[PDB]
Amino acid sequence: CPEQDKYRTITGMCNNRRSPTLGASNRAFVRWLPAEYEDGFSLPYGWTPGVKRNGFPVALARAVSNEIVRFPTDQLTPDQERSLMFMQWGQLLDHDLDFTPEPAA
Amino acid sequence: NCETSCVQQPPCFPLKIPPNDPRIKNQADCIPFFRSCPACPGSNITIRNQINALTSFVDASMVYGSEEPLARNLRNMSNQLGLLAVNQRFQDNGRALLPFDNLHDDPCLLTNRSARIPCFLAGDTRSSEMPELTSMHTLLLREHNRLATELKSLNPRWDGERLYQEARKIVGAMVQIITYRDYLPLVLGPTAMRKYLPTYRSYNDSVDPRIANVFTNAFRYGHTLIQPFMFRLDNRYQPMEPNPRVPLSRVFFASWRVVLEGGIDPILRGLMATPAKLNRQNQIAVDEIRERLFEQVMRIGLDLPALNMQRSRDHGLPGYNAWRRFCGLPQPETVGQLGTVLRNLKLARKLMEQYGTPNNIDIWMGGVSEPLKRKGRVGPLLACIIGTQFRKLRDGDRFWWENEGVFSMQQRQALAQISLPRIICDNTGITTVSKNNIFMSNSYPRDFVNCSTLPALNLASWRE
Numbered sequence: 001c002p003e004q005d006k007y008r009t010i011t012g013m014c015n016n017r018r019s020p021t022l023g024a025s026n027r028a029f030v031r032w033l034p035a036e037y038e039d040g041f042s043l044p045y046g047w048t049p050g051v052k053r054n055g056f057p058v059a060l061a062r063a064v065s066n067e068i069v070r071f072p073t074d075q076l077t078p079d080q081e082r083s084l085m086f087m088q089w090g091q092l093l094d095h096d097l098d099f100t101p102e103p104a105a
Numbered sequence: 106n107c108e109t110s111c112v113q114q115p116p117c118f119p120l121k122i123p124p125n126d127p128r129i130k131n132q133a134d135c136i137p138f139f140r141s142c143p144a145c146p147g148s149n150i151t152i153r154n155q156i157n158a159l160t161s162f163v164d165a166s167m168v169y170g171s172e173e174p175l176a177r178n179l180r181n182m183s184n185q186l187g188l189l190a191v192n193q194r195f196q197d198n199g200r201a202l203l204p205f206d207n208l209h210d211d212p213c214l215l216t217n218r219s220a221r222i223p224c225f226l227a228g229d230t231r232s233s234e235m236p237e238l239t240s241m242h243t244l245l246l247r248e249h250n251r252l253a254t255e256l257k258s259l260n261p262r263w264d265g266e267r268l269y270q271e272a273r274k275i276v277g278a279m280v281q282i283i284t285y286r287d288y289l290p291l292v293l294g295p296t297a298m299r300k301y302l303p304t305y306r307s308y309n310d311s312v313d314p315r316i317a318n319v320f321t322n323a324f325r326y327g328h329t330l331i332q333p334f335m336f337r338l339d340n341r342y343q344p345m346e347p348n349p350r351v352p353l354s355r356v357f358f359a360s361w362r363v364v365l366e367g368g369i370d371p372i373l374r375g376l377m378a379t380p381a382k383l384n385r386q387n388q389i390a391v392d393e394i395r396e397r398l399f400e401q402v403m404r405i406g407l408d409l410p411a412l413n414m415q416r417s418r419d420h421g422l423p424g425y426n427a428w429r430r431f432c433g434l435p436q437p438e439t440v441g442q443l444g445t446v447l448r449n450l451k452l453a454r455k456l457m458e459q460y461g462t463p464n465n466i467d468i469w470m471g472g473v474s475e476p477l478k479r480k481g482r483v484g485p486l487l488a489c490i491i492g493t494q495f496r497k498l499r500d501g502d503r504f505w506w507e508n509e510g511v512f513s514m515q516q517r518q519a520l521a522q523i524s525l526p527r528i529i530c531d532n533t534g535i536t537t538v539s540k541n542n543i544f545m546s547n548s549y550p551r552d553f554v555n556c557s558t559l560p561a562l563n564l565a566s567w568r569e
């Protein structure tokens with residue numbers, strides 16, 4: 001890493017001089033808690049039919065969405081103390097922080 | 106191909122359809138899903154982990170890129186002005202638009218076949234996902250070029266590289282200020298702001314600045330803020346006819362709406378003068394994202410809240426109680442205890458019915474279910490996850506705008522005057538903007554002022 005620098009590298013490399021990949025692009029996320037997979041290392045909960053998570057059936061994300069998230073859009077409560085710009089900055093900001101790649105179709 | 110089939114084979118993890126679904130009547134159908142790429146492909150040793158393709162730093166990497174070849178290609182290399190490349194086919198009332206990207210399977214081209222408007226090219230690949238996002242991306246592009254132009258007048262001997270880096274340094278600090286000064290206090294609330302983000306003291310090189318895997322899901326709390334329409338307003342802040350309220354299912358990847366439907370000014374006015382959707386325990390997320398997400402570019406409309414929950418599983422994220430314990434927050438075991446935590450027993454009963462145990466509640470689902478902190482837009486759990494992350498990004502950033510040596514005292518004093526309404530004033534045809542705080546202000550004309558009353562960024566202390 002250069003000893004004197006006025007500017008960030010594009011990749012984030014060398015921002016932390018002791019561990020120069022920290023916060024740099026194309027690196028694995030840090031984990032604040034150990035991962036929980038159906039097999040302990042790779043398969044996600046819900047992959048194997050009949051395989052339970054912590055003694056209970058894995059709820060379908062779609063069913064959870066239908067039963068808890070679904071609501072009549074006409075009932076929508078506008079936030080009197082927030083603008084739509086508050087939502088938009090959040091997405092814009094998320095896009096400065098993280099993009100999780102997937103394989104192409 | 107996870108978009109075309111329902112076969113559960115790598116890299117696909119399709120969402121299964123429950124019986125009596127309000128939209129998908131065939132239980133053999135699915136919601137498309139590609140598993141996030143592993144850090145160690147095909148390993149029998151590693152515990153699967155996902156990759157962050159971007160710099161974790163609040164450094165405007167969504168404008169500049171997180172890789173060297175893309176960062177080069179986003180720049181205007183035709184001269185020594187240190188500018189970002191602009192669209193060579195179109196302009197928004199004499200003002201710059203983002204360049205077009207060159208994708209083999211362009212999803213923007215599908216939103217309006219006849220229009221033939223491809224997706225935009227920016228530092229981040231999702232720039233065209235919604236025209237409100239594109240407008241924000243376009244605004245920051247013009248601001249970089251505006252800063253580079255004024256810096257050129259001030260320092261005529263600065264070459265392209267110097268001008269680009271100095272304007273880039275400014276844009277990043279502007280994103281940092283808006284985020285921590287204006288955005289985050291309104292997300293966390295004063296109590297969580299004081300707890301998780303205490304006054305900045307100094308850079309600490311022992312603070313890990315990486316994005317935590319859970320943050321990629323917890324920060325999706327913002328999906329609860331989404332209105333079902335894209336709102337466009339004219340110079341009088343009145344609904345812009347004939348399409349003032351476009352359903353969100355018809356704006357996803359709709360770059361043609363920016364190009365051919367009035368530019369970024371009606372979209373920015375709509376953002377400032379329309380209230381956000383309030384997250385309520387009985388009104389979590391709208392059907393424009395829950396039933397019709399990406400309807401125009403996919404074989405079936407996606408369900409964003411369901412994808413968030415499938416993603417937390419794909420990423421092997423612990424459930425609600427494990428994250429509660431991590432945050433030093435009580436972990437409810439019973440339906441009565443869950444009810445007390447959520448100050449809503451009816452919602453607690455529904456969560457227990459779906460999940461069986463609060464230990465299994467997916468992090469996004471339990472996080473957005475929590476009652477909101479006073480003057481905040483998240484409950485205790487999301488405030489701890491979000492607060493912790495943004496503390497690490499600030500404290501573990503050597504290029505944080507307040508870290509000594511990054512800017513001079515005079516530049517820091519000039520930068521403290523910046524605001525998002527001023528950036529709108531300086532780079533658009535909008536002459537009437539929200540009063541500070543822009544994220545609170547939402548009612549025209551009560552919360553609005555003329556641009557001429559707002560202080561501009563003083564670049565004088567950038568003269569070498």
Ligand SMILES: *[C@@H]1O[C@H](CO[C@@H]2O[C@@H](C)[C@@H](O)[C@@H](O)[C@@H]2O)[C@@H](O[C@@H]2O[C@H](CO)[C@@H](O[C@@H]3O[C@H](CO)[C@@H](O)[C@H](O)[C@@H]3O)[C@H](O)[C@H]2NC(C)=O)[C@H](O)[C@H]1NC(C)=O
Nearest residue numbers: 306307308309310311312313493494495496497498500501
């Ligand atoms: C520089 O920053 C590090 C890391 O700070 C940690 O992360 C931040 C984002 C905030 O959440 C901080 O509150 C948090 O401390 C500081 O080092 C850390 O200090 C604590 C306290 O000394 C360490 O905890 C100890 O852990 C051992 C067991 O492993 C116990 O026996 C001790 O009693 C104590 O709990 C922690 O491990 C350490 N972490 C690292 C990565 O070094 C550091 O103090 C701070 N420096 C300054 C000048 O602010």
Ligand code: HEM
Nearest residue numbers: 087090091094098099100235321324325327328412413416
């Ligand atoms: C117009 C507004 C928004 C969308 C359209 C949108 C869409 C998504 C989708 C499709 C994903 C990927 C989902 C999947 O796992 O399959 C996604 C991810 C993330 N969002 Fe979304 N989002 C819109 C709006 C917001 C707002 C306002 C957010 C925050 C305040 C927000 C955050 C996020 C985050 C952090 C992710 C994960 C990103 C990653 O890849 O690491 N979104 N959103």
Ligand SMILES: O=c1[nH]c(=S)n(C[C@H]2CCCO2)c2[nH]cnc12
Nearest residue numbers: 098099100101102138139231234
């Ligand atoms: O935040 C994200 N936004 C979009 S649009 N995508 C892409 C969509 C296309 C189909 C699969 O996912 C993401 N992939 C990973 N993260 C994101």
Ligand SMILES: *[C@@H]1O[C@H](CO)[C@@H](O)[C@H](O)[C@H]1NC(C)=O
Nearest residue numbers: 181183184188189190191192
């Ligand atoms: C580069 O800059 C010049 C001068 O501002 C401009 O005319 C030209 O269109 C720009 N080219 C690109 C690719 O942005």
Ligand SMILES: *[C@@H]1O[C@H](CO)[C@@H](O)[C@H](O)[C@H]1NC(C)=O
Nearest residue numbers: 216217218219220221361365
């Ligand atoms: C598609 O684009 C054309 C302009 O090229 C426009 O006239 C038409 O109304 C658009 N279609 C829809 C459904 O909005």
Ligand SMILES: [Ca+2]
Nearest residue numbers: 096160162166
């Ligand atoms: Ca970044």
Ligand SMILES: [Cl-]
Nearest residue numbers: 031032318319
């Ligand atoms: Cl994590």
Ligand SMILES: [Cl-]
Nearest residue numbers: 091231234235
């Ligand atoms: Cl997106």
Ligand SMILES: [Cl-]
Nearest residue numbers: 340535536537
């Ligand atoms: Cl105006």
